[PDB]
Design a protein around this ligand. Structure first.
Ligand SMILES: CCCc1cscc1C[C@H](NC1=NC(C)(C)Cc2cc(Cl)ccc21)C(=O)O
Ligand SMILES: [Zn+2]
Ligand SMILES: [Zn+2]
Ligand SMILES: [Zn+2]
Length: 387
């Protein structure tokens, strides 16, 4: 897949984007790759932080679906008008498809200064598409209309590659290990064990996946459920206790610095997440270096210093394995086989003495179902799904 290597740009803090062309003649736009959502949505009116956007009036192949859509986040919102147009990925597969496109007409705190993407590509499943699961996501349209294989892989480099329809063995080293997709909505997986510098957190493993665990290229941080977040911070604090940081650091709200080149990497522990194997009673681990969760941020005054933000944060909506965790790894989203693969990426994050790793198997004489069952609402229970 030589044509698809290096088809991503961006960083964990602002997102990774791929070029896509919409309409005819083709309008080229840079589009955020988001495995945490399922809508293809592009800015479609002027915005102070955009200079280009999708002009529906310039596309001869645009069709209005005459239905609006409103997508609120905790942190902002986008809204728009649904339609369809021709869509290609110029540094992707040699195919063109008719896809749904939400033309974003208004938004709040969605587009950010200097991100360089004008739209989001929701790669997750129809169950979570807005307004409902009848709006076919982009990837489903791609596979249905072209028989490209039903899989894509992400190598995020903190630069990167989204390989559509296959696995490129140049982008990884060592074994690819697969964890099952628990349910096809988010890319949901199950964590069976957590260690921080070799020490087991020793929590009921359902706590790890409360109320889900997901792989999300649209989220910067590793996000952890409250109880797990507190046990991890306690453990990382213990390891690094030669350094007393302000509370705002552990909250992600403040940088901590050392003199250029002197950052004591060794006092920050590795985190291993053991993911359910394809074989019952097997798991494998992904091992995250401190350089993945302590992220450099160059502030104006501190030119003499390397300064860092803590990129693990508390969640009330489950574990999120966001971009800073994926950056170590070649991640295969094998929708055909309902599984996600992890291998050590060819773009390595390095540490003096330790390596981000993917290792297995680890066998357990049980476990234990570590999956959590989200309490079924009457709203969910009642919608009919006639497919
Ligand atoms: C790696 C992408 C990071 C990135 C680009 S813009 C903001 C971020 C940080 C991200 N939040 C968001 N992600 C996307 C996928 C764009 C969805 C969304 C919508 C709104 Cl209305 C506000 C923030 C975010 C996070 O919470 O971590
Ligand atoms: Zn190009
Ligand atoms: Zn019905
Ligand atoms: Zn349905």
């Amino acid at each position: 897949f030589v044509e698809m290597v290096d088809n991503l740009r961006g960083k964990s803090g602002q997102g990774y984007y791929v070029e896509m062309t919409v309409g005819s003649p083709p309008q080229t736009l840079n589009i955020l790759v988001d495995t945490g959502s399922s809508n293809f949505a592009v800015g479609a009116a002027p915005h102070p932080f955009l200079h280009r956007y999708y002009q529906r009036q310039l596309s001869s192949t645009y069709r209005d679906l005459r239905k609006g859509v409103y997508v609120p986040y905790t942190q902002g919102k986008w809204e728009g008008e649904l339609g369809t147009d021709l869509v290609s990925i110029p540094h992707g597969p040699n195919v063109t498809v008719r896809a749904n496109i939400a033309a974003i007409t208004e938004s709040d705190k969605f587009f950010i200064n200097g991100s360089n993407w004008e739209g989001i590509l929701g790669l997750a499943y129809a169950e979570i598409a807005r307004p409902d699961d009848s709006l076919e996501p982009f990837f489903d349209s791609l596979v249905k209309q072209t028989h490209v294989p039903n899989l894509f892989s992400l190598q995020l480099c903190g630069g990167g590659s989204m390989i559509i329809g296959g696995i490129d063995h140049s982008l990884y080293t060592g074994s690819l290990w697969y964890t099952p997709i628990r349910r096809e909505w988010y890319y949901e997986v199950i964590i069976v064990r957590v260690e921080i510098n070799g020490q087991d957190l020793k929590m009921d493993c359902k706590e790890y996946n409360y109320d889900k665990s997901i792989v999300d290229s649209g989220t910067t941080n590793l996000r952890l459920p409250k109880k797990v977040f507190e046990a991890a911070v306690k453990s990382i604090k213990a390891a690094s206790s030669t350094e007393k940081f302000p509370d705002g650091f552990w909250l992600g709200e403040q940088l901590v610095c050392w003199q250029a080149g002197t950052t004591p990497w060794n006092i920050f522990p590795v985190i291993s997440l053991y993911l359910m194997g394809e074989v019952t009673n097997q798991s494998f681990r992904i091992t995250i270096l401190p350089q993945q969760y302590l992220r450099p941020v160059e502030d104006v005054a501190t030119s003499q210093d390397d300064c860092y933000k803590f990129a693990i944060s508390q969640s009330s909506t489950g574990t999120v394995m966001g971009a800073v965790i994926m950056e170590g790894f070649y991640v295969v989203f094998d929708r055909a086989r309902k599984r996600i693969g992890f291998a050590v990426s060819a773009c390595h994050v390095h540490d003096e003495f330790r390596t981000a790793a993917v290792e297995g198997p680890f066998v357990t004489l049980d476990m234990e179902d570590c999956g959590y069952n989200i309490p079924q609402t009457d709203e969910s229970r009642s919608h009919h799904h006639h497919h």
